[PDB]
Amino acid sequence: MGRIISIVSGKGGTGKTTVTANLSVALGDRGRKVLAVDGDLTMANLSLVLGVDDPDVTLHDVLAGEANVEDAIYMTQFDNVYVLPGAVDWEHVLKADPRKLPEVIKSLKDKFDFILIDCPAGLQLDAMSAMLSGEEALLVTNPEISCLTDTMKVGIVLKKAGLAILGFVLNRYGRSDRDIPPEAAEDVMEVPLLAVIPEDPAIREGTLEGIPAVKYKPESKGAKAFVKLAEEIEKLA
Numbered sequence: 001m002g003r004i005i006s007i008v009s010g011k012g013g014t015g016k017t018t019v020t021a022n023l024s025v026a027l028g029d030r031g032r033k034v035l036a037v038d039g040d041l042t043m044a045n046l047s048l049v050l051g052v053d054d055p056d057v058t059l060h061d062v063l064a065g066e067a068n069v070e071d072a073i074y075m076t077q078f079d080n081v082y083v084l085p086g087a088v089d090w091e092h093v094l095k096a097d098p099r100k101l102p103e104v105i106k107s108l109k110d111k112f113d114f115i116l117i118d119c120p121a122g123l124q125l126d127a128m129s130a131m132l133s134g135e136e137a138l139l140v141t142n143p144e145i146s147c148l149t150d151t152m153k154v155g156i157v158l159k160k161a162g163l164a165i166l167g168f169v170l171n172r173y174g175r176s177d178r179d180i181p182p183e184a185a186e187d188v189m190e191v192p193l194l195a196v197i198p199e200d201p202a203i204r205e206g207t208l209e210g211i212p213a214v215k216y217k218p219e220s221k222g223a224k225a226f227v228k229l230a231e232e233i234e235k236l237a
């Protein structure tokens with residue numbers, strides 16, 4: 001398929017890595033070959049969340065021109081799921097040229113059905129370089145008006161940049177009695193609501209376990225919502 005999807009947001013801590021990891025496993029479980037990419041250069045967490053904790057070669061090495069991207073592709077314990085991990089040390093962060101993200105990622109298009117890019121939030125250099133490496137964008141936001149409007153702005157930017165905006169995910173819903181309900185959130189976002197991921201301790205547990213909740217705790221509300229999201233993502237093909 002070769003669909004490159006940028007997982008983005010207007011703010012950090014909204015669930016980008018969580019959505020990237022769970023969606024990857026959900027899609028992989030449906031038989032699709034997935035590459036989870038950690039484009040969050042200053043806060044590499046994706047590989048750890050997928051249980052790959054010891055990679056010697058990372059995207060940072062590739063972006064520094066010190067390694068071929070082929071050598072930064074690792075297996076994960078999940079069927080059909082591979083990862084392009086990021087380094088955590090500052091020296092690696094410094095030497096990774098973010099401007100080379102688009103060319104590096106797109107060169108892998110023919111080897112996967114889905115390439116999900118975990119992006120840092122915002123509109124600064126690293127964020128833009130990562131988001132612009134994708135062809136499609138999945139907006140991730142929380143039930144906060146400020147988070148919604150900020151994420152909306154990112155979507156508009158990406159839309160103008162040429163990316164197909166698939167829609168958005170309303171994550172961490174139910175965390176507070178002040179949360180904006182889905183119907184209203186969609187009315188605000190101006191893009192299709194693809195899934196509501198509830199606030200669920202099971203998701204946090206998966207994060208700490210290094211095994212996405214979608215697989216670690218398959219009967220949790222969070223797991224089931226991600227399975228549905230994966231179904232929706234495939235339909236929008």
Ligand SMILES: Nc1ncnc2c1ncn2[C@@H]1O[C@H](COP(=O)(O)OP(=O)(O)O)[C@@H](O)[C@H]1O
Nearest residue numbers: 012013014015016017018172198199200204207
């Ligand atoms: N729906 C949810 N329910 C409970 N905890 C969640 C949910 N979504 C994310 N989290 C937790 O919130 C934290 C931030 O998520 P993360 O994906 O790392 O954010 P981001 O990549 O946007 O910075 C993580 O520790 C994660 O386990």
Ligand SMILES: [Mg+2]
Nearest residue numbers: 016017040045
């Ligand atoms: Mg993250």
